[PDB]
């Protein structure tokens, strides 16, 4: 990751003050980011290579100045409690933003927990994530960017067709 020169940082803060989110100086700054990733499931296929997404995202967010919290192998209720725990961290008061990275198997309206199955649905609705982190329930991140990154399927259909799987490739 190449850094932004201090002259550009002061240039954008002078030219477009009202148009950009205020960035706190790195002195008394405690940026927090959350990574939730599920690899092993009771009924679903093991997500091979999911560790290749954790460290890369964890290293990227660390290069961006975030302290990364990593929680793995969670049910839907486990994800919700870990998100509520992360949303109440006092470090958000001395932060300027947060990142939320969610990686697992997925459904149309939610992300799968470890216990998910056709007969045993274990799904955290993405709508619930917004409730946990909105201005009502997350006072530390009010007026601050909350970025949600989701790696998961959103259904079972293929995303391409013709108009007039490989061995090392898996589906989430």
């Amino acid at each position: 990751l190449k850094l932004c020169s201090p002259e550009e940082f002061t240039r954008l803060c002078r030219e477009k003050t009202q148009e950009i989110y205020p960035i706190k100086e790195a002195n008394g700054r405690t940026r927090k980011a959350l990574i939730i990733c599920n690899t092993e499931f009771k009924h679903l296929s093991l997500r091979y290579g999911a560790n290749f997404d954790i460290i890369g995202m964890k290293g990227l967010l660390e290069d961006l100045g975030y302290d990364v919290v990593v929680k793995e192998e969670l049910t839907a209720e486990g994800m919700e409690s870990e998100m509520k725990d992360f949303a109440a961290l006092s470090e958000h008061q001395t932060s300027d933003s947060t990142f939320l990275v969610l990686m697992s198997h997925g459904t149309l309206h939610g992300i799968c927990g470890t216990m998910h199955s056709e007969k045993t649905p274990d799904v955290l609705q993405y709508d619930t994530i917004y409730q946990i982190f909105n201005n009502c329930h997350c006072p530390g991140l009010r007026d601050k960017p909350k970025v949600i990154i989701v790696q998961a399927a959103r259904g079972g259909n293929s995303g391409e067709m013709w108009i007039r799987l490989p061995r090392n490739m898996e589906a989430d």
Binding site: L1, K2, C4, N135, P145, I149, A152
Partner: protein, 86 residues
């Protein structure tokens, strides 16, 4: 004090609704790999939306296992510059 209920959110999904998302056993998720790559190249000079749009641009050409990352439920009111290194 008065405030909105929901604001300053942005979501970046790996593909479109109803559709599968793919992952390489030897490299991880294609979406995560492209996202990290675009961030490393453009975070020093581009704000978050432009970075996301560059990720989406890299998926524009349809492939045999196509994905199209989508921006969702976005309530950013300003440009989010990360200013890496500051």
């Amino acid at each position: 004090k008065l405030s909105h209920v929901e604001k300053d959110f942005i979501a970046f999904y790996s593909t479109t609704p109803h559709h599968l998302s793919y992952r390489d056993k030897t490299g991880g998720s294609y979406f995560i790999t492209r996202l990290i790559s675009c961030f490393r190249k453009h975070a020093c000079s581009c704000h978050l939306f432009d970075i996301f749009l560059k990720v989406q641009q890299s998926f524009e050409k349809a492939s045999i296992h196509s994905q199209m990352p989508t921006i969702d439920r976005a309530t950013l009111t300003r440009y989010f510059y990360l200013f890496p290194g500051n």
